[PDB]
Amino acid sequence: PTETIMHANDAIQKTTASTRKPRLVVMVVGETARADHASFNGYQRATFPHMDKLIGLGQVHNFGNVTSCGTSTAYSVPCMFSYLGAEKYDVDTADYHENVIDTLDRLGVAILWRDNNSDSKGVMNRLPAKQYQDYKNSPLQGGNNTICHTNPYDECRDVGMLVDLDDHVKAHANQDILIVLHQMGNHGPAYYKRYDDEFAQFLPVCTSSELAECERQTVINAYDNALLATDDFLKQTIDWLAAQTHADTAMLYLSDHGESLGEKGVYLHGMPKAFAPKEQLSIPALLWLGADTPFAVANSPTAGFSHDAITPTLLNLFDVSTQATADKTAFVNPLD
């Protein structure tokens, strides 16, 4: 209790940014997006038009139906960055452990967490305050997001987290960089507020929080429109990374959990993972790698990928060697 449980005391970077090309990784933490409403997973609608074309051109890898560790934000987000797998993870004691962010920051990787969701759910607690930035509010309301007044709800948009991101990179031009963007995404129940008018293409839309009152299709339409906005956001995120040429880049996207959309009377999420509908545990996962990338996409295990692959992935992306993630399954193979 009075001091933290360590996992990566043996963590060593095999190569550092002073002996090789620096690495710049953006980790997008999604929200409520589920795998089967992704067009690149066989969904009848084109919910991810930009990603669909990048996948069909071989720019982005799709990891299929990935399993989340849990069915809520408060549960999953700490576990996504944990050294403990979903089966040994305890949400009530997550703060007692060092996480992969702690490790990376300790080894000298420049961490920046921008949040248009809620907060980092404890993950960022040991790091200096300035490394966590609130993007849920405009500055007047004490935030940092300059893209809020684009809609009648004055809700801050995810694309606002991409503004002035160059300044952080220029500040740490000599070292490895990890930027976590915590997305508002498909947060319900008011899906119709999650996207600007630009993406209101699936009509008509349920413009109410009473999801069980609306006809199911109108709720789905809103949900799918919010996916469109996320797809666009990921596209602009990839475009930004592609503009960074003096570094090896990577964009990793995973939703924190899926969503029930009226299946057998179940709405929203948060159902206990033991008997939760599989929709709440089914999430999309995408990887984008920059030009002349040193990294390789890992083979898919027969059981499929899960949230447990994130921490070994982030470590492999920064050449970190530790017995906390020796033989574990990652999205990206470990480099020599």
Return the H-helix or E-strand segment holding 218. Answer: helix 216-243
Nearer to Zn ion, 224 or 259 (CB): 259
* Window 37-76: contact mask with Zn ion (x via CB under 5 A): ------------------------------------x---
Nearer to Zn ion, 107 or 161 (CB): 161
**CB 118 → Zn ion: shortest distance, Å?**
9
**CB 303 → Zn ion: shortest distance, Å?**
23
Question: d(Cα 165, Cα 29) in Å, to the nearest integer?
Answer: 17
**CB 6 → Zn ion: shortest distance, Å?**
28
Beta strands in the chain (DSSP E): 12-13, 23-29, 60-62, 66-67, 110-115, 132-134, 177-182, 248-254, 260-263, 266-268, 282-283, 285-289, 320-321
- Only one residue has tokens 């033989």, namely 327
* Window 210-249: contact mask with Zn ion (x via CB under 5 A): ----------------------------------------
> Is residue 256 part of the contact set for Zn ion (CB under 5 A)?
yes
**If DSSP codes are grouped into helix, strand and coil, which group holds residue 317?**
helix
Residue whose C-beta lies closest to Zn ion? 73
* Window 193-212: contact mask with Zn ion (x via CB under 5 A): --------------------
Question: d(Cα 324, Cα 45) in Å, to the nearest integer?
Answer: 41
Question: d(Cα 7, Cα 230) in Å, to the nearest integer?
Answer: 34
31 belongs to an annotated ligand binding site: yes
Sign of dihedral through CA atoms 261, 263, 268, 272?
negative
**CB 296 → Zn ion: shortest distance, Å?**
30
Nearer to Zn ion, 32 or 316 (CB): 32
325 belongs to an annotated ligand binding site: no
> Is residue 280 part of the contact set for Zn ion (CB under 5 A)?
no
3 belongs to an annotated ligand binding site: no
HSE, CB side, 13 Å, CA atoms: give it for residue 184. Answer: 27
Nearer to Zn ion, 31 or 248 (CB): 31
**CB 323 → Zn ion: shortest distance, Å?**
31
Question: d(Cα 244, Cα 305) in Å, to the nearest integer?
Answer: 29
> Is residue 260 part of the contact set for Zn ion (CB under 5 A)?
no
DSSP letter, residue 177: E
**By the 8 A CB rule, do 306 and 330 touch?**
no
Annotated binding residues for Zn(2+), written as ranges, equal: 31, 73, 187, 256-257, 269
Annotated binding residues, written as ranges, equal: 31, 73, 187, 256-257, 269
Q: Which residues bind Zn ion (CB under 5 A)?
A: 31, 73, 256
